[PDB]
């Protein structure tokens, strides 16, 4: 057992996802063993990141400015909007180092259990961007779980009346996977979505 | 003991059995009741002597013509190519495929000791010789092996004019953008379908 001020660190660190007890203890001692200025850096980086967070006025992504870097990039293709559930999906998609389009961040999915409706996530503003803008394609890239799929599907009906091309990211068997260890639901999509040549 | 040493040799020849595991299995085995090791030994050869290969699809079942190829609706004009008998039960568990199969028993891996005549390719072409099949579905694994094998069977199948398709690569159901490898994600993106 540890002094209170250390128990307090350990407890605060253990609240973070993927940080168990032993891992928290370790980190606490490492931290309180770092030079005071290094621990000041950590501590301030934490507080400042939270304080400085803003949501882009165009796509709602996490940013520092009024309009995020991506939206203000002009040789980036504003006629294609990749719709995503969360800020960190934008990073995942952005790391695919193809894709010159822009983004729309919903901040969630439709979810009757969580009690989240379409009016509780950034859907209407997606509509408005498509209504008021010159949009060639909306790529629905929510997750392929039930709610990500319900959400992409809700959005798709909505955008129908506009004459936009709306696509959904390919479900299937992941690269490097094997048929044996693939759930039956994915096999089904892999088969059903098979493609020529 | 030379008899144990040979057991150990025979065991570690097998896939998934490392040197230590062969040895531990070897001792367990020589400790089993005689009638249990007889049974193990018997099961080994009996499965080799009784095994079949379907006359149409080359799957191992205990029928000369397997129950799928025999089934009257099953659609012989569409053939789903997989590597392994376990793959057939995988695909079947989806309670959705209508066509029939072609089991290769393996893939083409230079780095393992297997080539395009160590597996059941020529016999697949023969099925596609008379022009009576529409699509061959290529459903080898989306790994290195699987993919080689498939993009090749596909050249061979090019004549014959049949329609050849490939099991769709992408993000699996239940998966999420955060934990999907870039390669898979890039495929999910560049293969997106109009909803
Ligand atoms: Zn933005
Ligand atoms: Zn058969």
Residue numbers in the entry:
A (entry chain A): 0 to 196
B (entry chain B): 2 to 196
The article reads:
RecR is the most conserved protein in the RecFOR pathway; RecR binds to RecO, and RecO interacts with SSBs, then the complex facilitates RecA filament formation on ssDNA-binding protein (SSB)-coated ssDNA. RecR is a zinc metalloprotein, which consists of a helix-hairpin-helix (HhH) motif, zinc finger motif, Toprim domain and C-terminal hydrophobic region. At present, the HhH motif is thought to be required for binding DNA, the zinc finger motif plays a structural or DNA-binding role and the RecR Toprim domain is the binding site for both RecO and RecF. In this study, we investigated the structures and biological function of Thermoanaerobacter tengcongensis RecR (TTERecR) and its series mutants.
